[PDB]
From a paper:
The rate-limiting enzyme of ethylene biosynthesis is 1-aminocyclopropane-1-carboxylate (ACC) synthase (ACS), which is generally believed to be a single-activity enzyme evolving from aspartate aminotransferases. AtACS7 is one of the genuine ACS enzymes of ethylene biosynthesis in Arabidopsis, catalyzing the conversion of SAM to ACC through α,γ-elimination (top).
We swapped each of the seven boxes of Arabidopsis AtACS7 with P. patens PpACL1 and examined the enzymatic activities of these purified recombinant proteins. The asymmetric unit contains one AtACS7-R6 dimer, and each AtACS7-R6 monomer forms a complex with the PPG molecule. Compared with the wild-type AtACS7 dimer, the structure of the AtACS7-R6 mutant overall does not change much (with an RMSD of only 0.59 Å), except that the region replaced by PpACL1 BOX2 and adjacent region (residues 91 to 104) become disordered. Such a change shifted Q98 away from the active sites, suggesting that Q98 is crucial for the ACS activity of AtACS7, and mutation of this amino acid should diminish its ACS, but not Cβ-S lyase, activity. However, the AtACS7D245N mutant showed almost no Cβ-S lyase activity but still had ACS activity, a completely opposite phenotype to the AtACS7-R6 and AtACS7Q98A mutants.
Numbering used by the authors:
A (entry chain A): 15 to 74, 105 to 444
B (entry chain B): 12 to 73, 105 to 443
The structure:
Amino acid sequence: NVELSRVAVSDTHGEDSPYFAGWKAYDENPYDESHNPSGVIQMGLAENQVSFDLLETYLETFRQAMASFMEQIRGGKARFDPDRIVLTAGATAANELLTFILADPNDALLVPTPYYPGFDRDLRWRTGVKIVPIHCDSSNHFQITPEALESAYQTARDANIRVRGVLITNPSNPLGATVQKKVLEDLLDFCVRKNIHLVSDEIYSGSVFHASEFTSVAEIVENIDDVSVKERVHIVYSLSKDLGLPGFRVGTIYSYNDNVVRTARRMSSFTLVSSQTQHMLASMLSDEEFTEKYIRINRERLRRRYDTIVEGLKKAGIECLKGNAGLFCWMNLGFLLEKKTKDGELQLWDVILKELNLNISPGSSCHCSEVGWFRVCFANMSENTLEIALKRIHEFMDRR
Amino acid sequence: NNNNVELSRVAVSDTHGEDSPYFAGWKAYDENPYDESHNPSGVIQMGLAENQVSFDLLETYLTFRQAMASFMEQIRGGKARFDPDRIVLTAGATAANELLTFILADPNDALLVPTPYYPGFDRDLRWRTGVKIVPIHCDSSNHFQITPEALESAYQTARDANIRVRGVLITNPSNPLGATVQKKVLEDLLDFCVRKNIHLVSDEIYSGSVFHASEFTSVAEIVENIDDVSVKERVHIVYSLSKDLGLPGFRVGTIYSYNDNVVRTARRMSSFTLVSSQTQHMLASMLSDEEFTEKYIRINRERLRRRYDTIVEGLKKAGIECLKGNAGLFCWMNLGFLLEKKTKDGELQLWDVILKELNLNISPGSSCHCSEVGWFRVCFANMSENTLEIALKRIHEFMDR
Ligand SMILES: Cc1ncc(COP(=O)(O)O)c(C/N=C(\C=C\OCCN)C(=O)O)c1O
Ligand SMILES: Cc1ncc(COP(=O)(O)O)c(C/N=C(\C=C\OCCN)C(=O)O)c1O
């Protein structure tokens, strides 16, 4: 019999986590308004369909379009030379691709907790790079401290792991929260001192609720004119989340480093975007009058939905983190828990899954330093399916 | 200052292959590309193996795994069954080949690959994966086909130098040779793989472009009859739409693997290189349609064949003998005894005269790792009727002087 590679038989792909085991129970009997109203409702998949009718109602080289549409998201606060854009088949493809370019097998990336539980696959699986978690907690809304960067750096060098860059998510999945200007430039400054790359995964940037509150790492870069420090940062964007077009698989790497783009271009061979979809999204994304209209209404709609989910959970006795972005909220069932530990979280999540019939991302899958938090998505469902889901959790709390 | 950021070994590695002749030709092509009206004296591209001879049929025409399975069945002529549940879509074949290599081999382990091969394997297989290639050596003494003795030879090479070997990756039909592999050598190679306990990977990307349906033998043909699960799970097939359909920008390649354990790892690993669902949706009905895919593949086979005929007949009455080919989008022509120095440097110097003086891009055999000096791949399917007769008349009147 034939063996396969270490990588092949490695269980770093992550299909044993809670995250997936939820998706499996969802399919066992998915919710349906007419035909299965007691069925399980999906709130663990961070997808955006609240603004889809606008694209749908629309449709009755391409780098330039992608550059505009990025400019429009950031509000002329960035310039984006279409010649540095490198198309890759989704962000998951961009993040991995960068990691090959930015780190050796066994070297590391610092990643603030909580993070996208899917990084455990993307960054690690084929690349051989490790993650060292930068530890963050609810004492400051889970934001990156200059001391917790140093702490997590020392962790790596304590164990002979070279560190090669830090990969934040801006705005943060799962926190649903922008990072403040002041912490970005603080982090960039950390990167020149340690001589590493800053990777910004700006995938939720059209889904930040108020345009003024979002600070892209592009904002902190084309003003500071040292080529040495410019070439550390790189931006990873995709259409998957803002446009809600995740199956079209268009992500990009915009990198402020001449040497990356041309390696990233050659490396894109392995993960190209279908030219047919490039062609057919070109005019739309290029069209200022539309992208302006779209992003304004998307911001609002996502915001207005966030409001109803936290108000719902408020008058049922659940306080969420003060969020201003993303397609989800980061709700606290800390002091609403049995055992106050990791096993207690996984046991509570199994009651939510089996009894509420409700899929929710548990904080332990996100590597949260703190026990008892949960990501609940809201943008992959109707108005009505949310009020059902809220009424399900409202009347679960009644039984206390 | 002096506080500059390094990149990875892989990043600064020159295994991406943009120093070869292959690319340096593409760069001189752009300097002034050929154009019938605008500028004919311009350089003609015969180094890019692309198919546009049968495109007007798709143009005049216009889950999804089921379509891809049918279309593959139609290419092989019901000689394969293809469970759509084993198909794993990847963004092109270059993405499939790499993806498999991660699944089939560790960093520093090897793959045996018969020479000559797609010079782009030097990137695909090696670059991110850390695997090496050991060439299986083939020569014109038997039309560059794989011998059981040259497999053993190239295996020993690896084990001589402590390189574990993990599978062999043939191209069927062969790029650049333009030539099918015979049934007898495939099953001979499959037998080699059970004895050494390795995988056989078949890159069947040119399979709709083999000229006569009866002459092509897929590794799928040699497998669903032999019913040992042990030996079945060694082979894997890599196909794409890029070359037969001539739809290379839509980036749809697939891995069909006869190994339960691969498909589910290959599926999870496809995350990194997915096919746009929009193109999947819009190619679905077409590829599913038997009446059309039958008609298409018959005419494509013929058209590619009829073009091959004119290119070798052209080169014949100008004194160039090509290899007897029956497939692909190219021919493997011999300028061995039509050369100055008879060595690698002599080939690269001859190719620079063809590029600068003929104004003609042609893949030199040295880029393809050919064991033998002086051969060249010349593509023909990425150009009109007329641009070929110009290119032929250019080489005809070079031989005159
Ligand atoms: C920060 C971040 N980066 C990248 C991606 C990948 O998206 P791409 O452009 O490659 O489609 C996601 C999607 N994360 C959500 C997952 C979506 O579906 C994939 C399922 N694992 C989630 O639930 O957090 C994300 O949240
Ligand atoms: C054996 C083999 N494998 C893989 C590929 C990659 O094709 P994909 O399915 O990824 O589109 C090619 C095409 N090789 C040609 C390259 C074509 O370039 C495409 C330009 N976009 C060549 O010149 O040899 C090939 O001959």
